[PDB]
Amino acid sequence: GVPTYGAIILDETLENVLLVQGYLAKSGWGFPKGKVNKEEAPHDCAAREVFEETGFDIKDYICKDDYIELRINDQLARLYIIPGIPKDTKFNPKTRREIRNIEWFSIEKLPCHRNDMTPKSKLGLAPNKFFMAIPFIRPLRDWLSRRFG
Ligand SMILES: CN(C)c1ccncc1
């Protein structure tokens, strides 16, 4: 699969993260991100996708070595970490044909796994509207501990 790039944006207290909600197959909440174009650099893809989905320009804030990268089913996703963005920033997507809503979420209240269905003696996982964000949550909490305290 083609690699994806985007951002984990936090506010000034470091408590809250910015998620976006799409439609249809992307109907839950996730970090803003998308597919890299031919010959496009990673930092430039991350700024472009984030500006298309939120209207906020990260280009002056990106730090090259401050990101979390995961490989999921053989596709690579890298999210640059962007702290200290004020909670009263006004966000607006380019087209609301792609993005339903944009909200701040408390980091400590978000799940870092889905729940099983062992009460039903049934295999698999229950649905969760944060399914796209979940894989990054534990690594993010660990990264904030190591780099802030
Ligand atoms: C600023 N903010 C939280 C939003 C703006 C645009 N769409 C939804 C929410």
Q: Looking at the 3D structure of the chain, how many domains does it have? A: 1
Ligand 1 atom showing the smallest separation from residue 101 Cα? 8
What's the CATH number where 32 sits?
3.90.79.10
Instruction: Say yes or no: CB of residue 90 within 6 Å of ligand 1.
Output: yes
Give the separation between CA 81 and CA 78, rounded to whole angstroms: 10
Structure tokens belonging to residue 78 = 């890298």
Q: 127 C-alpha to center of ligand 1: Å?
A: 25
Give the separation between CA 106 and CA 86, rounded to whole angstroms: 14
Backbone angles phi, psi at 18, to 5 degrees: -100, 120
Q: 139 C-alpha to center of ligand 1: Å?
A: 26
Mutate which of 19, 87, 90 for ligand 1? The one with the most ligand atoms within 8 Å of its CB, which is 90
Task: Kindly give the pairing relationship between strand 33-35 and strand 116-117.
Answer: unpaired
Residue 48 lies in domain: 1-149
Contacts 24+ apart (CB under 8 A), 112-120: 112/137, 112/138, 112/141
Give the separation between CA 108 and CA 135, rounded to whole angstroms: 15
Resolution (A): 1.9
Q: In DSSP terms, which residues pair with 103 in a beta bridge?
A: 19
Give the separation between CA 64 and CA 118, rounded to whole angstroms: 43
* 72 close to 95: Cβ distance less than 8 angstroms: no
Using the CB atoms, write b or e for 16-45: b if 16+ within 10 Å.
bbbbbbbeeeeebbbbbbbebeeeeebbeb
Q: Which amino acid is at 84?
A: G
Give the separation between CA 1 and CA 71, rounded to whole angstroms: 10
* 17 close to 141: Cβ distance less than 8 angstroms: no
